[PDB]
Symmetry: D2
Subunit: 233 residues, 4 copies
């Protein structure tokens, strides 16, 4: 009945949009969830809506010490991590010509560096048989104006799921990537998208649940497009 019964899940960007929708679906499937985001007010609000089986941890995953404090809380409250969904950060655009060193730093810090140490630091807590989701994007395989660094970073994320599938196979930890298209989170993609609509956080959440749950038990290293077909035709 309950596809994640008593598993423990950690979700970064767990504050809002997709990461929050996932938390909620996780909790409905019977998991216990750590939502990890940066603003306290927004964590409290999130924890309040999810309502049960949820701890809110304030941390910036681009900071080594924040991560250490995170895993000391997960070890103390729950002891182990069965699932890690890495859903942090947002898009900042810049054509090649405008890219500044600091803009490139902002993107890469959040999408790659942050992610690497997030997953690195979770290894001691990860159970054998566990599941790690990275968040890549349609941007990873498209040539989209002013998405220079975002897209490059997301392609690199997709790549980490292959490598880590190789490195973590002895522990039987599956690593996969989700590549969302346009997902409604508080225009001309919708136009060139076969289902003709933006997606709902809830649908991304379900695709993530597939990767999280026992149903994707023979699924490893993939890149799961959830884009209503954008990149597929």
């Amino acid at each position: 009945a309950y596809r994640l019964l008593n598993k423990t899940a950690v979700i970064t960007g767990g504050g809002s949009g997709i990461g929050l929708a996932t938390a909620k679906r996780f909790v409905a499937e019977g998991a216990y969830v750590f939502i990890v985001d940066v603003s306290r007010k927004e964590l409290e609000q999130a924890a309040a809506e999810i309502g049960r089986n949820v701890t809110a941890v304030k941390a910036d995953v681009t900071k080594l010490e924040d991560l250490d404090r995170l895993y000391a809380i997960v070890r103390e409250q729950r002891g182990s991590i069965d699932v890690l969904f890495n859903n942090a950060g947002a898009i900042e655009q810049k054509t090649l010509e405008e890219i500044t060193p600091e803009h490139y730093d902002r993107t890469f810090d959040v999408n790659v560096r942050g992610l690497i140490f997030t997953v690195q630091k979770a290894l001691p807590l990860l159970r054998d048989g566990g599941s790690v989701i990275l968040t890549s994007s349609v941007a990873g395989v498209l040539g989209l104006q002013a998405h220079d660094t975002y897209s490059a970073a997301k392609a690199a994320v997709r790549s980490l799921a292959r490598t880590w599938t190789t490195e973590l196979k002895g522990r039987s930890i599956r690593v996969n990537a989700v590549s969302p298209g346009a997902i409604d989170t508080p225009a001309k993609f919708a136009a060139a998208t076969p289902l003709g609509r933006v997606g709902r956080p809830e649908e991304l959440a379900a695709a993530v649940l597939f990767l999280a749950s026992d149903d994707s038990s023979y699924v490893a290293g993939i890149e799961l497009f959830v884009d209503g077909g954008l990149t597929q035709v």
Copy 2:
């Protein structure tokens, strides 16, 4: 707890292996299933195993008139199709050098021709928002000795997922390919496979259920690799 409650499914190659594993998972999820396959004896054993909510139909998907009769049964019995799973066929191996006309026809008639007509002919019963799954293979992206025609054929299937995605969008019908690696069916693939083992048919059924169910409602046109990481690393 019932991901396909009251949904009607049609599964070709439903008499054994993956077809039959999926037919069991579907019924466990509340669907009504039509299993379709060539041997009557095998269809009966399969129906008895499933146990309930099943009709067995004898049809060879490479014969137009057999498909006509399948669909008339379906229509009279249930009146609509929510999920079509196309899983007919088996591998036959010949190197370029050994390829004959009949060998070429056995592979393409089953894997491509018959798929085309199955789906064409299901069109009038398929609801809007229904889900169509095709069976490709790791073979469709690999260069495997003596797999000439089977690989080419399953690459042709993965392609029709893309075109049907565009053609069928007006009806919101999702078309997606699954691509199994090595599956247990009554060992070298397994050697270079990160998961270190063949898949169980149930694990393949669970991936197809994903595509069949509403958790994949924003997912269209894709190639879902269920190969333990074979082609991903």
Copy 3:
């Protein structure tokens, strides 16, 4: 200066468009070319235009005995084949609903059936270390309204390059697919093409030249998109 000096090429579809453009460039590169195609009027025209170091052969390469007659001539006049460029056939359009058996067979006959037996009966003649080129298409990776059978067959063609890479590696024969986008031969593709225009036949001939020549000696089983960026952004 002469990148193919004294090499023997066979080109199918050599009477027009890409095939003919490629026969001209291969003769300018110092090759001796066989052009193979169905129209006698068309072949003699092409042969006059090409000028020198060309033999026209009227053959329907989906007929096994025409192939036999073809290679019997190649072997008699020039021994062995250094370069085989397979570029026979044209698009035919039908939506899923409109596909008939006849339309399907024309498509897969020209594109997949004849190509297999073409390259099959070429084997005893191909020199070790030679180069075989397959014409697949952007269509092979796209979901183009009413391109059902043509896209599937061109995706099957791309798969055969991977398969024959493996099978023919022992004789160091390279097999690569070229995947043309819109070429200019006697619209909206051009709206989404970054280069903003259709390709010239000469430009596709230049890309095939690359596969044919020593410049691609460490290039094998690839899909080379020649589409002004169409499938890449």
Copy 4:
């Protein structure tokens, strides 16, 4: 004979390996070449081997003021760039467990930050209709033990070719990536490589030449694998 007559090329990583083999081939094709690299002693050595039509420049392509100086030199002596081939950097291996902030910085500064600003700063000098080549890698689509950051960064590089195809199309600048497999520099990657050997640096220069010349005039945004079949079968 001379496929780059009177073109100006700039190569980063020009002091050795692929850069150096490519600079040699470019001069053989009548280009004027600027070899760019860190080592003085290494560069004068390289320039001596080329022997003509070449200016060595000493720059660390990860320092912005080094790029300013390189481009002011190019501007003064040649005025224009027709070809920019980016080939700076080397692998360093670390498993996820071993990754340090410094190791991460080395790989991404050299492969991605450095790549970005090199191209950004060539923009005013690059002729309209020029060719810009990037060095990705087979590692960009593989899950290779201990290649975490290098693979991820090469995949970054691959995506930048898509994005720059889009952003630069108005100027008709083609941007494509080359992705080498095992290339012989000063044991089993070759194990299941179809060609049964590591590639020569000359073979990779020839491939890069293809991308710099008119023969790829309708090729934009591509990933060109030069890897003897590794990633293709």
